[PDB]
RNA sequence: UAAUUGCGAUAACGAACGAGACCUUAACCUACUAAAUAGUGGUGCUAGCAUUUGCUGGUUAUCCACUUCUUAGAGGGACUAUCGGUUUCAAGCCGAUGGAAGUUUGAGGCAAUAACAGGUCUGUGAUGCCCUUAGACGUUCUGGGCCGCACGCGCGCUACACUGACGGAGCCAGCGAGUCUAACCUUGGCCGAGAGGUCUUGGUAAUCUUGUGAAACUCCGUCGUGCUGGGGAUAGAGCAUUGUAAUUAUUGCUCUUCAACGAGGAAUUCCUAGUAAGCGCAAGUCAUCAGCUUGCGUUGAUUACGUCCCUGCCCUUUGUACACACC
């Protein structure tokens, strides 16, 4: 036996957040720990958002296993929030009918904070002459 | 406390020697037929409203 | 020794290689040939050796030693 | 701004001029049609051309245009 | 001139004033009284012994308390 | 209210109290209208948001800042005066405290306290460099946020007050044009310089 | 049913295990915990005079449990913060090594850790259950 | 919950080692008034006197008072390791000391006479008012005074 | 030696600051 | 057997990636065809003037190195200059 | 138009260089070929809480499967698409819609003609001429100096604190480097407050250091507007490290001394989106020494989406007694 799952990711700029979603009863864990425990924790609502926006109940015959790498303490939570939102529609595509799918898909995008599209922003490269990519060193003239 | 109310309906152009200000014609929003043209300070768009009191002096190009 | 060998190769189209035609000009200047016809000769060589263009340039003391730099070129080049 | 170079303009007119009946108003179709009837060395060029040709197309079918 | 440690010529004020405020926080105190603040933090901590102040949220730097229950 | 729950904990202050109305942290967006008008659709209080933190891209065209909640740009305008720059997290914490302080100084609806703060914040017309002009509905909001966050920021620096209180202080303060408002102190005293010179 | 540490709140867990270890009073602290500041990185010693070592020890146990094994080295980096170099810029500097080592050493004469292969200690079977059990109580810190 | 009343037991303006320390500062920091004691020393000399650090100088009654003064004068005899001390390996005696409140500037001024007298580089510069740790002078230490 | 310097008076620091600085130390741009 | 392969030419060493991938298995021995490894970029940054004068202008040269591991006389089947080739047992 | 970029106007017509194209790099691919030096699921084995089956771990292959995450080959993809508004109803500008992506997609590499007595002979065994060539301006050795301090100027670092300092706790990157006639990167064990010491270990490296557990930051506490626990200059004493050698302190550590600095005059630098600003980090240098540079990632905004008022450049018109060209 091999439980049927689909598998998605979420991305915010450096953070990749893989997500396994099979048929289950309630396990929702980022980095092997209950979703209720992610503690940057102003933003805990930014990880909660996908669940409430769609309705707490479609997560009963579910399970999410997330582990996130990269970025920092805030880019990881965003890669999370949309690594799982991007998976609840891969499981409603592979295993469920469509209309429901493009009803909760639209439930998110009515709201979307990049919730199923990768935020493409990435760091500009620094260049010689300043400390940043547009910041330039200062000088004198005399 | 005489306070106007004027939605714009177009943006005639760019005033100020440094491009500081725009011009716009507006509709006074109770007796809609009066329409006056005046200039602004911030960024403005079509259909925005404004609050002034100088219901004449209708200003124009400016150095 | 023995674990190292060499081979030879005549050059294919000795005009279309600009180091063969770099020392080209080193050498007929070591024979003192007049600057212009010296340059003009190698460019008139690699022009109809089948090259879309060619440019040969030289800088220094041509005319008794104020520094100038004349350039000789025919054909089509790009730079970008 | 996004203004089209002469290389991508003169090539568009050069195509329309002698292929008009076998073009049409969709990028993707012209996009693919170009790869046979003409040699182009880069894809973004290919697409830039196929895009102006198509922009032309939509307007020639709402009236003839000068050149 | 503040009052670092409880004088108690200025203590009975601590319960005969605490409901005149509908907002209690370390600064509301040092502004109104001349408590040190260092231990005011424990004035509010202690003042929450029986609940003559109402906790509505508390945080490492900000404590927001409201006139009693 | 559909009290469902699955294997993981899923606490109940959250299970209901925003699934049924998806409000601010615990605070409601309905029946808080923008009392003053000609500044509507510029102050966004009608697309509900919870935490004043998004993956915002508001600075690509001119007026996408308009469809930005008045809150998250009030929180942005805090993390400034550069030793504070880019600490959005600290700023959201500052506000979540301030909204509670205002709600216990005046047991109103707190985002009505904030919009009723910036009604009389930004000039209705202004000086400029050679005579008076009029102010746009967006350089009202924008300089408004500016002059006030700068007032609450400068009020707390060498003073034992916090930055949640000073912010709540300068907020109800200019929320009743009280004239103890650095915001309306510049605002009350740079418009009358606007109708005077000409 | 089925409590595992990974389901607890980080701080209040470790803040209660530091009290379980102070109560149990048989974890061996050294004679210098009154005199040291836990890193060259820092400037002052921890003003929780007596407790502090228990906090540290607890937090460690909780860390090796969720890792696979953890050497004294890596612990020094975890706990070391940024140094203040005066009129020069702040760079990262590690934590004291004897402190970290003596806690990892004194945590096996309690049976919570044990020298894994590959180096470093690992969690113990006793340790695994002590924490899995000590979670469930402050877990039910609701009536 | 130390709201407690602390009536006129609270010893205002205490004096010590020919100095004065304001009773209103928390003990560990109120002590640093004294040349010789730093915050790190005044932390543990107060740990070895069973001092409730949670409190401050007007409190900490006169028995704990000379209970710390003596740990300070003999730190090496109260489990205080040698590194913690300011003057070790003295150079005339070879014991480990902590020069203290009026005695710090004394044995520092002694340390300067010390090598001014032997006419050695560090001392010469000390006498010239110049700077003795090899730093640049062209640019820095302006407004000499 | 060093004793030739240390007690060589007139060579410390107010023997410097006494004298003003040569007014040709703010003067450039040949 | 394992053939780590490493060269400085992305084009000229997928030559042998291809010329043994199924020169193996038209000849029917094995699988685990090319496992491509991170292309190592060797960057060297330096100024442009050989003196110190001028606007302070920097250059950076790259050298990319691609390696591929595919798991005695197709030794010489695989000879192209610039492509380095080894084994392991 | 960013552009001699184009529409047009046209005694011009047709073209070449430059710009563009090109190339690199960052963004999309559940579509192809794939993988113990990358992951993943199950499965053997196994630990802990539970027992209600379950949750969470340990096993470098127990065995299988696979390519979503990863790496990198071959391609796809954007053309400013579609629709609307202005417009010679032209090139184009703007608006919404989708779209990974719509500001030359972001960022760079390349870069014409002609020119300057700009810099470099102290990069070169590139170099002409003058100089010197054995009381050598060749070279090597000892020691000193380039840092010498009444002061003027330039780039910076650190701060004035409560949006903080400190203590504890939570803990998340990317760009990278590393030992053959060898001593590089170094886990781990032990010892030492520390800095460091010692015994082993892996790695010529997607395999070991390394998840580089970085800092900012978050939380919970102590302090509470006082040159204060802000600030850490000067300086005394001691312990280590590199090195033949540390004195004029190389650097690190420990205690003690606690300065100016309460937002900085006239003047003035950089900046438009993952940008500024903050934060650290690797690499260059390196026996040792970064407050420097070259790049990387983390946190992450206010204001602009305009103008020629100021400086500077470009084109045109115009004046000219300038052409060594307004020095
Ligand atoms: Mg996990
Ligand atoms: Mg950067
Ligand atoms: Mg000791
Ligand atoms: Mg850390
Ligand atoms: Mg820490
Ligand atoms: Mg510092
Ligand atoms: Mg120095
Ligand atoms: Mg042209
Ligand atoms: Mg070209
Ligand atoms: Mg594998
Ligand atoms: Mg497995
Ligand atoms: Mg869109
Ligand atoms: Mg590109
Ligand atoms: Mg010259
Ligand atoms: Mg040279
Ligand atoms: Mg030199
Ligand atoms: Mg020098
Ligand atoms: Mg410079
Ligand atoms: Mg300090
Ligand atoms: Mg901290
Ligand atoms: Mg020792
Ligand atoms: Mg101080
Ligand atoms: Mg001394
Ligand atoms: Mg270095
Ligand atoms: Mg340098
Ligand atoms: Mg740097
Ligand atoms: Mg003329």
XYZ file of C-alpha atoms in Angstrom, chain F residues 5 40 47 56 144 148:
6
model
C -11.838 20.189 14.149
C -12.740 57.228 -0.426
C -11.001 44.704 1.727
C 3.078 43.943 -1.186
C -0.915 63.080 6.778
C 1.743 62.253 12.408
